[PDB]
Short mmCIF file of C-alpha atoms in Angstrom, two decimals:
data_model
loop_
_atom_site.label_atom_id
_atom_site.label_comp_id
_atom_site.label_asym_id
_atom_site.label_seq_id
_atom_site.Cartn_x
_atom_site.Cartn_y
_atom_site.Cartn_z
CA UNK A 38 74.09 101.20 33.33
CA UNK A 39 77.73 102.13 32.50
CA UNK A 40 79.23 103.16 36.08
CA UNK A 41 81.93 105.39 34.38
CA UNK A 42 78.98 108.10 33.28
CA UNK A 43 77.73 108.73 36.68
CA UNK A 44 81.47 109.53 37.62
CA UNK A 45 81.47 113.06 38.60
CA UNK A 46 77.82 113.22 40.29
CA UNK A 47 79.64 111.32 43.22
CA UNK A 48 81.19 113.82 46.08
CA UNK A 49 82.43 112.70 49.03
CA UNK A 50 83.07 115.47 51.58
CA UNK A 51 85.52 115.18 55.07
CA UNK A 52 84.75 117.15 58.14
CA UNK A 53 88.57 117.01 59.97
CA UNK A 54 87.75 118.43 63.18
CA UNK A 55 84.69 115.74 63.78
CA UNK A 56 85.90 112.54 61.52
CA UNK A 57 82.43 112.40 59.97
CA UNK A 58 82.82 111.02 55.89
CA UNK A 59 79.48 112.40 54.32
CA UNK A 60 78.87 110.49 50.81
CA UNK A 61 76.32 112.76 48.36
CA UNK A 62 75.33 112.32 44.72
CA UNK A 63 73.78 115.31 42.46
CA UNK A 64 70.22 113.46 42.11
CA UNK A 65 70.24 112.15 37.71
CA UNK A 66 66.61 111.18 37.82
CA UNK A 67 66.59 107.35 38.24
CA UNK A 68 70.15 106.67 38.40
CA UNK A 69 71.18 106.33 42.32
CA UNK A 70 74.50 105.50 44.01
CA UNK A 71 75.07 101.73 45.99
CA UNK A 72 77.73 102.65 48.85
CA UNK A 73 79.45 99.33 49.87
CA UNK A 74 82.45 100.73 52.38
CA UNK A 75 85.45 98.42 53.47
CA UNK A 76 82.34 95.34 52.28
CA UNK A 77 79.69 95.87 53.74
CA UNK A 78 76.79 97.02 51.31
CA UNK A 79 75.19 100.16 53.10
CA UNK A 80 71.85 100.61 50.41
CA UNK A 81 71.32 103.51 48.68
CA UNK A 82 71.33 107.28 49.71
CA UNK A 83 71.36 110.69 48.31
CA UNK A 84 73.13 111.99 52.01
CA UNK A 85 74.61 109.41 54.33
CA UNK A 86 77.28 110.55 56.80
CA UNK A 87 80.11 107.07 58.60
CA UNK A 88 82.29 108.13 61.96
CA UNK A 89 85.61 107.62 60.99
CA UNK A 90 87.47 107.68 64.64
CA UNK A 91 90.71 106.59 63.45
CA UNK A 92 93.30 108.62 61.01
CA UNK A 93 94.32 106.58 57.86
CA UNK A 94 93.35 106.43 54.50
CA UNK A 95 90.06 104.82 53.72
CA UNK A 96 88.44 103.57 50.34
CA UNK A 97 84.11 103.92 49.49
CA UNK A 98 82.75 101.37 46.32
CA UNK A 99 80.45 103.09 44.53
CA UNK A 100 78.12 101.49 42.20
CA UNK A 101 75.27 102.82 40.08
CA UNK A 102 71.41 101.33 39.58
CA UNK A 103 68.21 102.07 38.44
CA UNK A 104 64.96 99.97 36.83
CA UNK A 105 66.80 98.03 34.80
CA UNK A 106 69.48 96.95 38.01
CA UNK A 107 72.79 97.24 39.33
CA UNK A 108 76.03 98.03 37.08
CA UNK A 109 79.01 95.32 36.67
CA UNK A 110 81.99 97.82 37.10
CA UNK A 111 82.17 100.36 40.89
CA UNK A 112 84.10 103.78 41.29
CA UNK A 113 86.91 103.46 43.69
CA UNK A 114 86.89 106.88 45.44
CA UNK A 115 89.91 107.54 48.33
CA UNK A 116 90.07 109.51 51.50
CA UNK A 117 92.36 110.76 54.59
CA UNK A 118 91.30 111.19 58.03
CA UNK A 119 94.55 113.45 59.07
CA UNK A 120 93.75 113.02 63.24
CA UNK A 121 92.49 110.34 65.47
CA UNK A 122 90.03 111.30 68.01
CA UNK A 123 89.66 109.75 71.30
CA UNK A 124 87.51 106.94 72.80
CA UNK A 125 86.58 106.20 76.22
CA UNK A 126 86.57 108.68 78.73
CA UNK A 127 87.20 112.25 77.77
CA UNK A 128 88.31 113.85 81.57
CA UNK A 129 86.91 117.03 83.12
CA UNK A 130 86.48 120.41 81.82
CA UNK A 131 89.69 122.34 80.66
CA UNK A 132 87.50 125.72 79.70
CA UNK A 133 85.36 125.72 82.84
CA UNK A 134 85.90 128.29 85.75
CA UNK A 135 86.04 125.78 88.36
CA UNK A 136 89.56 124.55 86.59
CA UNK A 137 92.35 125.71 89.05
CA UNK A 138 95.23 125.12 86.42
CA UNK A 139 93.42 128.64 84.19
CA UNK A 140 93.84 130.99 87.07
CA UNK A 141 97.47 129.23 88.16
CA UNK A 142 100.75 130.55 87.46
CA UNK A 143 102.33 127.80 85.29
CA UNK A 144 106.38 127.83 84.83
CA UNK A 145 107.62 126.76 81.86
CA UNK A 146 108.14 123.02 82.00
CA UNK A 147 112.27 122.14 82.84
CA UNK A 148 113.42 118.42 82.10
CA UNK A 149 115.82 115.35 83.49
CA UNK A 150 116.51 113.31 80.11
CA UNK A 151 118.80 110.81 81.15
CA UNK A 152 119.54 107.67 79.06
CA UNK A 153 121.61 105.07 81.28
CA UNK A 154 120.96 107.61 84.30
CA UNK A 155 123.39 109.95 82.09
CA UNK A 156 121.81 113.32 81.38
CA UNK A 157 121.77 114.45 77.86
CA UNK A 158 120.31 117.92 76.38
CA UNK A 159 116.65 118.95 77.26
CA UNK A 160 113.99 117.48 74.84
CA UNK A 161 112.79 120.19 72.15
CA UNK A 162 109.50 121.03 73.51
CA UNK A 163 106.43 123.23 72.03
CA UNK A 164 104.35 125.03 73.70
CA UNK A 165 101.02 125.67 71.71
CA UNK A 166 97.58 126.69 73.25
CA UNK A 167 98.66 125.42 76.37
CA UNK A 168 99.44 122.02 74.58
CA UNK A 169 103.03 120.90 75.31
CA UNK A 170 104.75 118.71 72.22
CA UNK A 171 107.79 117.21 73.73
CA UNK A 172 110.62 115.03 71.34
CA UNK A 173 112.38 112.57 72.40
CA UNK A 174 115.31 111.07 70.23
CA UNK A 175 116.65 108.48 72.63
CA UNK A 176 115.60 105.46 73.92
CA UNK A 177 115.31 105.44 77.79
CA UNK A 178 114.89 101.92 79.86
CA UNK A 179 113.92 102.99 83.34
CA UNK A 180 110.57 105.29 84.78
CA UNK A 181 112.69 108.43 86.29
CA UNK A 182 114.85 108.70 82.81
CA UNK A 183 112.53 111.56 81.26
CA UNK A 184 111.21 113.81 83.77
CA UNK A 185 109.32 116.99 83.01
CA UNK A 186 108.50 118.96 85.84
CA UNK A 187 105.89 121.93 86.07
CA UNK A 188 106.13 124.27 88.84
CA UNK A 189 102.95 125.94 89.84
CA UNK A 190 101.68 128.09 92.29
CA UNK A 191 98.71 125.94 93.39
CA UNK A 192 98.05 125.99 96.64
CA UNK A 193 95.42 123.10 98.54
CA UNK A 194 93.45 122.60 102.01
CA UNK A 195 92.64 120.11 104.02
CA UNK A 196 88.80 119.45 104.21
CA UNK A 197 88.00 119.97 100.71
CA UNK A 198 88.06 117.16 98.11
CA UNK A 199 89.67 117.77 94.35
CA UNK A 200 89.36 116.26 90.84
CA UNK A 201 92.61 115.73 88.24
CA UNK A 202 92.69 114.97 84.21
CA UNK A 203 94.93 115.24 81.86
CA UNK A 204 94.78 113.86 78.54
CA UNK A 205 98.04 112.08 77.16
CA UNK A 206 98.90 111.03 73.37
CA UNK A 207 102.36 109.25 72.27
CA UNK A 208 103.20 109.04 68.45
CA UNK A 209 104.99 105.50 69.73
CA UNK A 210 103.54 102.54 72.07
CA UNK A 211 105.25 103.74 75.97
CA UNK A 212 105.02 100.74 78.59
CA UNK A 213 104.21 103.22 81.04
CA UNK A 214 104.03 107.37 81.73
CA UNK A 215 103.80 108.47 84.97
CA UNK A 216 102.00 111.30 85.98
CA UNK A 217 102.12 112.63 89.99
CA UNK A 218 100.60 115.92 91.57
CA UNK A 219 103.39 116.67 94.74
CA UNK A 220 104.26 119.21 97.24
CA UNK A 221 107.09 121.12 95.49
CA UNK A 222 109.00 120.78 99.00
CA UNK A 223 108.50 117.68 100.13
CA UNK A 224 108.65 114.56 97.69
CA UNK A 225 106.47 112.31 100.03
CA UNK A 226 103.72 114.26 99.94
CA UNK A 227 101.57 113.61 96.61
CA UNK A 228 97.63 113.21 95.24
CA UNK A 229 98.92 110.58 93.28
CA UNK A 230 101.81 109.20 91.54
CA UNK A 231 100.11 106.83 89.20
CA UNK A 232 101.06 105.25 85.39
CA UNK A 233 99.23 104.59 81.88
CA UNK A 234 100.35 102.59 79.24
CA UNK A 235 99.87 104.45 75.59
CA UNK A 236 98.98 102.90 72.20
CA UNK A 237 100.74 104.62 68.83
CA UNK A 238 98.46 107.53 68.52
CA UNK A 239 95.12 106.74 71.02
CA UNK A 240 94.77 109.55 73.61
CA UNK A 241 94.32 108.25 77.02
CA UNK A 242 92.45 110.45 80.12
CA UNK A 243 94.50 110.17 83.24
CA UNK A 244 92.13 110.77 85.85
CA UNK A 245 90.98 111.09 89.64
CA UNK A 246 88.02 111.86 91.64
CA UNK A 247 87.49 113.08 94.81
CA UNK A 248 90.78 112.85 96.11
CA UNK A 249 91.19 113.80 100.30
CA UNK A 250 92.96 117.33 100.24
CA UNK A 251 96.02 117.99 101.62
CA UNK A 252 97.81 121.64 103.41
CA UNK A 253 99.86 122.19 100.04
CA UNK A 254 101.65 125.66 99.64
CA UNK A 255 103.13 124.87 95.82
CA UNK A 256 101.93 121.93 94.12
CA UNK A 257 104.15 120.86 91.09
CA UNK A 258 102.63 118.35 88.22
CA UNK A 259 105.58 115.98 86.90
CA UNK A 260 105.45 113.62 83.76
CA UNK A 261 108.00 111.21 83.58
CA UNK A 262 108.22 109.70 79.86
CA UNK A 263 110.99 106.88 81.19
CA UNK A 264 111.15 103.89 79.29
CA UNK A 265 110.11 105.80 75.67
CA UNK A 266 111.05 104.26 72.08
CA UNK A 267 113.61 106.64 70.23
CA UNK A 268 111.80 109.14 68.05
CA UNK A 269 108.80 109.31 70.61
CA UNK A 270 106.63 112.40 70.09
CA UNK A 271 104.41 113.25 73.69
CA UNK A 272 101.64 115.61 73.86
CA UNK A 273 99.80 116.91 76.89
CA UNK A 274 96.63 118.60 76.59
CA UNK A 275 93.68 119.65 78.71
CA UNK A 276 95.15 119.61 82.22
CA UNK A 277 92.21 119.96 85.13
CA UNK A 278 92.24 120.27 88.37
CA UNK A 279 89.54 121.58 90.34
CA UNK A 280 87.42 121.44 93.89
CA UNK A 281 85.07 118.07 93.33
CA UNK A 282 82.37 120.39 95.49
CA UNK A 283 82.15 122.12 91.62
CA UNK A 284 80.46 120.44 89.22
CA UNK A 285 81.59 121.37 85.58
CA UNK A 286 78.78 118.95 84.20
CA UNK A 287 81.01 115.92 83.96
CA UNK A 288 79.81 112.06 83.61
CA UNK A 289 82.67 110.67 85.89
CA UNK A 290 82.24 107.11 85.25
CA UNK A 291 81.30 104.52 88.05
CA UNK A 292 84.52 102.42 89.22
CA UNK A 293 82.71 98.78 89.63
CA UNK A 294 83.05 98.16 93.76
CA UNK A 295 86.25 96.74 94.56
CA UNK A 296 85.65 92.74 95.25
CA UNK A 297 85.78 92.05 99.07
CA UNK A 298 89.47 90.40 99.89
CA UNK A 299 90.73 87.37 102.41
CA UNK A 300 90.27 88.64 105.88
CA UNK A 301 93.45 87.15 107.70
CA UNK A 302 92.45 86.47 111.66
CA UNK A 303 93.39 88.84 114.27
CA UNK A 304 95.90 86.87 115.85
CA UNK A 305 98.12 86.32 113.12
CA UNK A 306 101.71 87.54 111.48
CA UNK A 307 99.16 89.52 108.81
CA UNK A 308 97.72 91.46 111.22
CA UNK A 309 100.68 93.88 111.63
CA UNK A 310 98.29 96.27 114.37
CA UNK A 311 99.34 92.72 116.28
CA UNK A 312 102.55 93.31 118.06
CA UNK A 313 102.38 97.19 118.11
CA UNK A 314 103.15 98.46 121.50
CA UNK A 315 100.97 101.90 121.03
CA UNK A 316 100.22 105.01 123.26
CA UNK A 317 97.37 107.32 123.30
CA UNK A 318 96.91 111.16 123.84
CA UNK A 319 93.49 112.96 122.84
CA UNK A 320 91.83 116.00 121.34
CA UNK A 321 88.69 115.76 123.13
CA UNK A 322 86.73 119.61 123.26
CA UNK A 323 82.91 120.17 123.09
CA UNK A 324 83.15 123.74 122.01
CA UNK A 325 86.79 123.86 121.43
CA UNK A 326 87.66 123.54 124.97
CA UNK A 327 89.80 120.90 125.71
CA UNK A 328 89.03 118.86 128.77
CA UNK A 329 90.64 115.80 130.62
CA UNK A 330 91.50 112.87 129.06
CA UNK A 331 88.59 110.14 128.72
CA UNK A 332 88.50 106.61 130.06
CA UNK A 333 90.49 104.06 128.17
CA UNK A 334 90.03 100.50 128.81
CA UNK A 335 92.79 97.82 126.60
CA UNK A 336 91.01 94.44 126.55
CA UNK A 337 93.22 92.38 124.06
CA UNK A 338 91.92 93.00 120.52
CA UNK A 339 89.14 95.37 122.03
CA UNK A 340 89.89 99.01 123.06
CA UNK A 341 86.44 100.86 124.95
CA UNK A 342 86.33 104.55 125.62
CA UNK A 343 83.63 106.20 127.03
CA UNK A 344 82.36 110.10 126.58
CA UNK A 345 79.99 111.30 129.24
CA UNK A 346 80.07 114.68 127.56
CA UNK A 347 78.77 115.45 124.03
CA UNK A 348 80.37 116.86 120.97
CA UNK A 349 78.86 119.08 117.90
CA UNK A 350 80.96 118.56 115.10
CA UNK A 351 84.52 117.14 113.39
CA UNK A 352 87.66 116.82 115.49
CA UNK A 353 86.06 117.35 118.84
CA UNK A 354 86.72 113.95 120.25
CA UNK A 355 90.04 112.83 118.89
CA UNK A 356 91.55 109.15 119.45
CA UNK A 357 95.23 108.73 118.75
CA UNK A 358 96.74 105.62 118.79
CA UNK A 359 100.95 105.93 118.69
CA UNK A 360 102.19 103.10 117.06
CA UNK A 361 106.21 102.56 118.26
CA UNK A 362 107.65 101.96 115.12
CA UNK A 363 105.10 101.24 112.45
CA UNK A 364 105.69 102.02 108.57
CA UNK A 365 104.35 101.37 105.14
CA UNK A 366 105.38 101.56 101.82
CA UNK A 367 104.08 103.19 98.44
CA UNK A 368 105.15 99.70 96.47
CA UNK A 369 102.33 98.24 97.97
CA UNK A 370 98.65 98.14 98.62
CA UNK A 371 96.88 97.51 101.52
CA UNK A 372 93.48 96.49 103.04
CA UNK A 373 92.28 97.58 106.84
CA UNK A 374 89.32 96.50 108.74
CA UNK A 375 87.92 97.88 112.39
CA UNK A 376 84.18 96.84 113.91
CA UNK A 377 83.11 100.07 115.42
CA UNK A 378 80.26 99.96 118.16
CA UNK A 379 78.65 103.38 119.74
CA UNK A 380 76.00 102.95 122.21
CA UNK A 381 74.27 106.17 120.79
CA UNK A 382 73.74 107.11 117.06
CA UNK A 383 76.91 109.18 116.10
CA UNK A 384 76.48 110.87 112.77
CA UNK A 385 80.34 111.09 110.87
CA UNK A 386 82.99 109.05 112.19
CA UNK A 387 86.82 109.16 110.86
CA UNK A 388 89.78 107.10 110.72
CA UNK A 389 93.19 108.01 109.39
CA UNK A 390 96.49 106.33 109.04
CA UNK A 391 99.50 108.91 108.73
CA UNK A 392 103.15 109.62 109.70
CA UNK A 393 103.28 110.77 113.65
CA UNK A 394 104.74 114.17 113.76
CA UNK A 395 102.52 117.59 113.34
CA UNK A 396 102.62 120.02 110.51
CA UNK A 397 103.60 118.84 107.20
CA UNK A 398 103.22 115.16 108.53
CA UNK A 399 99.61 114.82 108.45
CA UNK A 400 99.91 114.89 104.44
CA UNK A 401 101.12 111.64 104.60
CA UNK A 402 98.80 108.78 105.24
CA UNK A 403 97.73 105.61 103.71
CA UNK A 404 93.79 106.35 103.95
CA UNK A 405 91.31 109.19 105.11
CA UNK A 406 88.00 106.79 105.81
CA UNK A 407 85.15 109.79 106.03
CA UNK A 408 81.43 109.84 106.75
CA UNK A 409 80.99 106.48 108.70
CA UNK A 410 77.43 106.32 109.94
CA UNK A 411 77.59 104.37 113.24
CA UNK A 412 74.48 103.67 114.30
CA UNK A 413 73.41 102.64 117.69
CA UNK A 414 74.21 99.34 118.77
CA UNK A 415 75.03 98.00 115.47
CA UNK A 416 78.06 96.63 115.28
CA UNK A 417 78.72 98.55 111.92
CA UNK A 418 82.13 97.37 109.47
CA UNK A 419 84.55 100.56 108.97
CA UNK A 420 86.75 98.75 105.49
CA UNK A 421 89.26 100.13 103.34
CA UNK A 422 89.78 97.81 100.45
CA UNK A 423 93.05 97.74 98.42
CA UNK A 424 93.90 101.35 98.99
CA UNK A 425 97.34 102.37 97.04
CA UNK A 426 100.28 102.65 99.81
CA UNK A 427 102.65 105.78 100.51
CA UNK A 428 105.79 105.50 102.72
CA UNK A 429 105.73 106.25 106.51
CA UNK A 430 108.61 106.15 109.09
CA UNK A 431 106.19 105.45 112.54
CA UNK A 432 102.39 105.24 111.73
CA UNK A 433 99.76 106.58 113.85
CA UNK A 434 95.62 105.84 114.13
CA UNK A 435 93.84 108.53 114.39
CA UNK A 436 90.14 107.88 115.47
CA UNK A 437 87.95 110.97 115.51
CA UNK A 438 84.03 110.99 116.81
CA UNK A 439 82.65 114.48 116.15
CA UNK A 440 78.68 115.32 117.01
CA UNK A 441 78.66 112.75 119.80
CA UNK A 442 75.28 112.27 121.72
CA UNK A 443 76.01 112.60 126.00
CA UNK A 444 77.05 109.47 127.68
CA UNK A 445 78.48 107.46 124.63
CA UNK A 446 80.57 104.31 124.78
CA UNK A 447 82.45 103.56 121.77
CA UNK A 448 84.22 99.79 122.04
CA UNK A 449 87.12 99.50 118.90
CA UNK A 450 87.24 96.02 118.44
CA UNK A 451 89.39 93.89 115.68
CA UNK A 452 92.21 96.14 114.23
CA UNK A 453 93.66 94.79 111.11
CA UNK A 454 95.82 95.77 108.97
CA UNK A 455 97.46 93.54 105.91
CA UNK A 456 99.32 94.01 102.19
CA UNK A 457 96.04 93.03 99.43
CA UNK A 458 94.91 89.57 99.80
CA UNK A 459 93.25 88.96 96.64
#
């Protein structure tokens, strides 16, 4: 069977927008095509379809047989695949009406490009279907070095719960992007101000889930493109955020429980709640009617606190303890621990770490632990493992126990606070 006969009854035909490489032949009776791609003999089809994820250019052997056998010589037939297409996680829905960035006004991006901390002209930039192409022709060292700010007029709450992606492609490997979601007034005040790594050309999702909301009047989204080969080419596509209450159909994928660290003692220089010379005032109001100030008895290590009267719901019976002179920091990560025993079943418990002023302040804490189910007499665990830092000038504990049967004694025993162990 001479191969160079059956030469034009072989088609091979390239979907772009899927990467799917379908190999046909116009059926000559006996005579059938042998596909063996990159070596690998596939057998014998009339329509056979490979996923070809990655752009390049890519090369099918094709052979011809029939009753007599397979021919001596193969057709060496070449083709393109002009776009890579992603893998792993693909982020939430850009089209979908729950996406607060479609009903947003968006300014037009501005730019810091600043090689040695020396600003140079704005990046050429491209906006295209609400895809931004940003150029960068220098080489910059240090994260900070190649902002892009977008102002929006997104405004947040308190109480409800939201979900971020963006999806982030870099013509040239970047050591790290940074992506954060921040009050356009104050800088200390952010959802997140996290990094990714990118690989020449594979899109990575950036993503969050149910993140605690904050009173926001202007969020702004800034990308920071800081330490970025010369010649880098960034795009930015399909930017989401939206309330996680909504459910756009997304398969969010499970984040494997975060490994249980080493509990330093009470007692010791780790336990940084150890040393803290605190003060208390309350918000406790069955109705919304604030009343006097309930019993507070400091044992050491154990603070009990008793409620004769009952509450209905969240924020009724408030617990702050003023810390004189606590902080944290956003360079690190921390754990906490508390043992929290009620004497009656109370339904959803809360604990919050944050800066100790009103207003604006509350926006600034470490952790917002929600729905604790302390049940009665169990001495029930309330854990915060490895939770990302932010900066505070004098820290405050905020306990809260909201739907509170009558005659309730809550004991807080074994405050501790520590950077990650593990």
């Amino acid at each position: 069977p001479v191969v160079s006969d059956y030469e034009d009854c072989i088609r091979i035909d390239v979907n772009q927008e899927t990467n799917y490489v379908t190999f046909s032949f116009q059926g000559q009776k006996g005579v059938m095509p042998i596909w063996i791609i990159d070596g690998k003999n596939y057998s014998s089809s009339f329509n056979m379809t490979k996923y070809y994820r990655k752009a390049g250019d890519y090369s099918v052997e094709v052979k011809i047989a029939n009753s007599n056998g397979v021919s001596d010589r193969a057709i060496t037939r070449n083709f393109h695949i002009d776009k890579t297409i992603m893998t792993g996680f693909g982020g939430f829905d850009p089209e979908s009406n729950f996406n607060i960035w479609r009903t947003a006004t968006i300014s037009e991006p501005t730019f810091w490009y600043a090689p040695g901390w020396s600003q140079i002209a704005d990046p050429a930039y491209s906006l295209v279907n609400g895809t931004y192409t940003v150029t960068l022709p220098e080489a910059t060292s240090e994260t900070w070095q190649a902002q892009m700010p977008i102002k929006t007029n997104i405004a947040t709450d308190a109480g409800k719960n939201y979900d971020f992606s963006v999806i982030l492609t870099s013509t040239i490997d970047h050591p790290n992007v940074t992506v954060k979601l921040v009050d356009a007034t104050e800088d200390k005040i952010y959802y997140f101000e996290g990094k990714t790594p990118l690989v020449a050309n594979e899109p990575v999702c950036f993503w969050k889930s149910n993140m605690p909301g904050l009173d926001i009047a202007n969020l702004n989204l800034v990308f920071d493109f800081g330490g970025n080969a010369a010649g880098t080419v960034m795009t930015i596509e399909s930017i989401v955020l939206k309330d996680h209450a909504n459910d756009d159909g997304t398969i969010v994928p499970e984040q494997e429980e975060t490994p249980e660290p080493t509990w330093s003692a009470v007692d010791s220089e780790d336990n940084l709640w150890h040393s803290v010379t605190f003060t208390n005032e309350f918000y406790y109001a069955p109705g919304w009617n604030p009343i006097a100030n309930p019993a507070l008895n400091i044992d050491g290590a154990t603070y009990t606190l008793n409620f004769p009267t009952a509450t209905n719901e969240k924020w009724q019976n408030q617990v702050t303890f003023i810390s004189d002179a606590l902080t944290a920091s956003a360079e690190e990560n921390y754990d906490f621990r508390v043992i929290l025993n009620a004497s009656n079943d109370i339904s959803s418990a809360t604990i919050k770490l944050v800066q100790v002023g009103g207003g604006d302040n509350d926006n600034i804490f470490v952790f917002l632990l929600e729905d604790v189910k302390l049940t009665a007499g169990e001495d029930v665990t309330a854990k915060v493992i490895n939770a990302k830092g932010v900066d505070i000038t004098q820290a405050k504990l905020v306990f809260d126990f909201g739907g509170n049967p009558a005659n309730t004694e809550v004991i807080i025993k074994d405050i501790i606070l520590q950077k990650h162990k593990d």
